[PDB]
């Protein structure tokens, strides 16, 4: 198998230096897109025509052209509790772009 898909990735905000302004949560599930893009290319990675063309060119010239990439293609928000300019804990209900919703080959 080993095709491109969504897998678990728990991110700790202190590990990445963001606990300076994110009070809560301490960690969250961000997910990660793992695996490769290579033929045969499954339906669920929704391959673009350019990703297909690039994969073919990469097979013919592996050292000159790169492969198609397994990336997040749709993201979801989370809620974070942050300290505002006044230092008061404030809720950001939909903090966009924080968690993978779908993966794909691009
Ligand atoms: Cl396309
Ligand atoms: Cl919001
Ligand atoms: Cl946002
Ligand atoms: Na982490
Ligand atoms: Na080559
Ligand atoms: Na809601």
Swiss-Prot record:
UniProt subcellular location: Secreted
Stretch list, region Interaction with ENG: 79-93
Effect on the protein of changing residue 10 to W: In HHT5; impaired protein processing and function
Cysteine pairings via disulfide bonds: 4-70, 33-103, 37-105
Involvement in disease: Telangiectasia, hereditary hemorrhagic, 5: A multisystemic vascular dysplasia leading to dilation of permanent blood vessels and arteriovenous malformations of skin, mucosa, and viscera. The disease is characterized by recurrent epistaxis and gastro-intestinal hemorrhage. Visceral involvement includes arteriovenous malformations of the lung, liver, and brain.
Family per similarity comment: Belongs to the TGF-beta family.
Record's function text: Potent circulating inhibitor of angiogenesis. Signals through the type I activin receptor ACVRL1 but not other Alks. Signaling through SMAD1 in endothelial cells requires TGF-beta coreceptor endoglin/ENG.
Record text on subunit structure and interactions: Homodimer; disulfide-linked. Detected in extracellular fluid as mature homodimer, and in complex with its propeptide. Interacts with ACVRL1, BMPR2 and ACVR2B with high affinity (in vitro). Identified in a complex with ACVRL1 and ACVR2B. Has ten times lower affinity for ACVR2A (in vitro). Interacts with ENG, forming a heterotetramer with a 2:2 stoichiometry. Can form a heteromeric complex with ENG and ACVRL1. Interacts with type I receptor ACVR1.
Protein name: Growth/differentiation factor 2
Species per Swiss-Prot/TrEMBL record: Homo sapiens (Human)
The organism's taxonomic lineage, starting at the top: Eukaryota, Metazoa, Chordata, Craniata, Vertebrata
Span covered, complete protein: 324 to 429 of 429
């Amino acid at each position: 198998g080993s095709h491109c898909q969504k897998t678990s990735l728990r991110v700790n905000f202190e590990d990445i230096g963001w606990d300076s302004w994110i009070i809560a949560p301490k960690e969250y599930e961000a997910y990660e897109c793992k695996g490769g893009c290579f033929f045969p290319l499954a339906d669920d990675v929704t391959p673009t025509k350019h990703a297909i063309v690039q994969t073919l060119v990469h097979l013919k010239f592996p050292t000159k052209v790169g492969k198609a990439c397994c990336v997040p293609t749709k993201l979801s928000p989370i809620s974070v509790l942050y300290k505002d300019d006044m230092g008061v804990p404030t809720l950001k209900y939909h903090y966009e772009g924080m968690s993978v919703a779908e993966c794909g080959c691009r």
